[PDB]
């Protein structure tokens, strides 16, 4: 959709993979504020907001914290902190037509600058003059919106750019959004370190006879010692035995 009517999707309770974002090369900008792109899969996020729109290339500088411009002032405002990433890629082939692509519009005129993360879908005629406008278009009455007018041949600056903004609302609230944690192969009867289910430990892993149900993830015994656990990848229960040690 257009920049003034920017689409918002609420994203939560998922395994948020960002490897696809890294792998693709068609993208132009991965500008991230308050967060490291390589560690997106590492942290857990309370909630994600996906803002999708299409902008002019020369205006991609206005999608940034503490920035000013017609798009920034009247179309889309980004907070100064904004722990999140703006990802923009050129879309000249997809979003330009023979003649003019007038389907996409931006708001020329507005009474005041909109607050961060505010959407103004109003189509009321703006009164630039002293005389009351009363819903007509005149010398000082102007339609707020105006089309991009994309052509097949256009300057890089004036060619369309598809932009997606990620509003990562960090909070102590339940972490709905978490990156993939990756995994490793299992190891048979040998003294190894392990981090099953987040439980760090050292020992040998043996196939066991202890049995239980999904009411459990990991096992223990007397004196609060972990001596069994099911691996998440196989749901197989293994005894943890301390690595061989003793005096000499």
């Amino acid at each position: 959709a257009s920049v003034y009517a920017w689409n918002r999707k609420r994203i939560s309770n998922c395994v948020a993979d960002y490897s696809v974002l890294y792998n693709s090369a068609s993208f132009s900008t991965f500008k991230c504020y308050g967060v490291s792109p390589t560690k997106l899969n590492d942290l857990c996020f309370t909630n994600v907001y996906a803002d999708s729109f299409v902008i002019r290339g020369d205006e991609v500088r206005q999608i940034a914290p503490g920035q000013t411009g017609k798009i920034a002032d009247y179309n889309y405002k980004l907070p100064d902190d904004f722990t999140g990433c703006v990802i923009a890629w050129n879309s000249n082939n997809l979003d330009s037509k023979v003649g003019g692509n007038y389907n996409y519009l931006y708001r020329l005129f507005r009474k005041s600058n909109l607050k961060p993360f505010e959407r103004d879908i109003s189509t009321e005629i703006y009164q630039a003059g002293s005389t009351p406008c009363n819903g007509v278009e005149g010398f000082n009455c102007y339609f707020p919106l105006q089309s991009y007018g994309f052509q097949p041949t256009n300057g890089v600056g004036y060619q369309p750019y598809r932009v997606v903004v990620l509003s990562f609302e960090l909070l102590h609230a339940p972490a709905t959004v978490c990156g993939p944690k990756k995994s490793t192969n299992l190891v048979k009867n040998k003294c190894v370190n392990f981090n099953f289910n987040g439980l760090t430990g050292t020992g040998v892993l043996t196939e066991s006879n202890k049995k239980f149900l999904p009411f459990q993830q990991f096992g223990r015994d007397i004196a609060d010692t972990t001596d069994a656990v099911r691996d998440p990848q196989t749901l197989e229960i293994l005894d943890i035995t301390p690595c061989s040690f003793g005096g000499v």
Partner: antibody
Amino acid sequence: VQLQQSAAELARPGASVKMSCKASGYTFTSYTMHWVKQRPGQGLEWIGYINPTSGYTEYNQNFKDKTTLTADKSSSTAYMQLNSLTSEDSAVYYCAREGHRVGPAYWGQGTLVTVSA
Amino acid sequence: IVLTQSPASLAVSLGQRATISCRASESVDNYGISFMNWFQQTPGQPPKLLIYGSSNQGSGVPARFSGSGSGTDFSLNIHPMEEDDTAMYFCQQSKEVPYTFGGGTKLEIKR
């Protein structure tokens, strides 16, 4: 958005001419409307405009006295009144609609008015 | 505001650049944007909106037409000139109440 005017009216000097411009394809209530003259083989000169909803007309100093600008929202049309016609008034006139930040944005055909005895 | 239109009668061959220049007594840019407007009129037809603003192209306008400029200086570039381009081209200023047009340029195919 289409504009249909009258056709080639003939008047003697000293008479009065009332002529019409109907507009279709749009509201006709949300756009101010402009009038333009053009003498044969000459430049284009704007006369004046009106807001259809409120009877506010603005004319040039040149055309303030002799020109009268009216509109009818019920029939969605426009009317020109020319009084005390002279030889210089013989020309082709153009009916213009507001749009795209332009005063005379959309132009409709034209009326050839000839003032001679 | 008075508009002066340099060359107002230009003849170039088909497929060649056709440039018409427009200047104003005062500045044409207001509210950031530019209020220079560009029209085309063929014989027997009323003028049509072609270029609104300094650079933005009008509805039903080929990519051949290109308007550019700022302040008081504006230009029309016509690189792939076609047969239909033979017409009279006009300037317009929209900031002030008195609407004044340019000189008017009749474009003809050169042979």
